[PDB]
Design a binder for this molecule. Sequence first.
Ligand SMILES: CSC[C@H]1O[C@@H](n2cnc3c(N)ncnc32)[C@H](O)[C@@H]1O
Lengths: 236, 236
Amino acid sequence: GAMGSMKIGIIAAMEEELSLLLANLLDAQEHQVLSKTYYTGRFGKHELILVQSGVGKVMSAMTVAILVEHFKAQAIINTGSAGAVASHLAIGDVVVADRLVYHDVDATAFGYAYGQMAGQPLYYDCDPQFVAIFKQVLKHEKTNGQVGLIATGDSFVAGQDKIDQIKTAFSNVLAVEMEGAAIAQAAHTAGKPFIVVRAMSDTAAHDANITFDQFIIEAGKRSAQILMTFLENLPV
Amino acid sequence: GAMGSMKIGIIAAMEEELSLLLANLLDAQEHQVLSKTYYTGRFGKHELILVQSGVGKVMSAMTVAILVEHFKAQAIINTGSAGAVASHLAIGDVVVADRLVYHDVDATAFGYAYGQMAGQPLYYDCDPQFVAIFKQVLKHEKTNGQVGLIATGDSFVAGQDKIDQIKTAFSNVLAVEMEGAAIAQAAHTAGKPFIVVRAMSDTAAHDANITFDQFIIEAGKRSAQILMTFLENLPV
Ligand SMILES: CSC[C@H]1O[C@@H](n2cnc3c(N)ncnc32)[C@H](O)[C@@H]1O
């Protein structure tokens, strides 16, 4: 592209988390690759490749490999919903991850840290460039958006017992979801900068499915709006 | 004749199996993609792509995505070793999985069965021809083995109480390991037939007096030999 324009891959697990970004994409074109639809186009000064990956670690990690190998993405961003687990964090609030960790990985029998996949770091560090820009977006909005740790696992967290297990393991976790550390692990192995941004759909309580169904449209929308302000502020 | 020469991706976890397969490839070429090493060449009537397996769900999902998109694999074979969890299996027996399931996935709040990923079946199905052909190789070579279920999660499960929990949840499980169902979920998403096979490194009672890393030296060679027979018996 011109100057420092980037090709940015953006992954949302579900339709509600990608619809608004698609409504913003200029010069859009669909592509079918490994049975998923990728949408190329422009936003602000950058080129995006959007995809609805499907939920969880395997689906999201496949889309990072194809975004980098096939679409030549230079950065990877995940957006969508999450369950709020920290104190002082409500439904509709935004968390931008500065680090990702798995809460459901136990290879401690091979002498790894709890949460650490073999052959990987325990924490995946979001790009510090992107964190600083998103930190300034949240600041300018002047509400309750936070930057901190998001934890991932292949489970939808719904109950105090699994909140307590996660916070015992990682006391500073803000929110939980099913793709952020998977996308971070994949983009880290590919050598490309990444970040995760989420808006809270629920508080991961025993009946969190009912709350998620109420708020998933809003959570997808809110995460996407913050992401677009970041893209407007990412220079070239 | 039918589909002709099949491009087959082989994800081999045992380094002595991968070295023996590579030693048999015609026109062997080395390739780096997303920082990982793949070998392409021919064996018998087929073109192969060989790669060392990574560990866990995310590295498995990237490997299948790259084998299919970059190298145009039309089928995925994943081999390795794992301890038995069913009582009747002996050290060195070969489990040919016909189904894979996750033991560590909980989206039950939404009404899914335990183990079932959102948007997926609870069990993934290995290709029925590949399962029959492998079972026949074992029979022809008078090598003991069994067809059945393998359960996967992003943990190494060392505690027997946790093993018994997985057996309570999935009654017919023969063995538990860290990549098979992610290979299955990724290859199925891609629309490619696949199969997962494991040599049993230990019995359910832990009778082995050789370690896993020692077991896989000679087992990797045995598994390479069985695989090359399977590839000779895969029709064009
Ligand atoms: C339908 S499975 C839940 C989907 O929404 C996100 N998510 C939203 N709230 C939660 C929660 N409480 N626990 C886990 N993942 C969540 C996940 O990353 C996944 O894509």
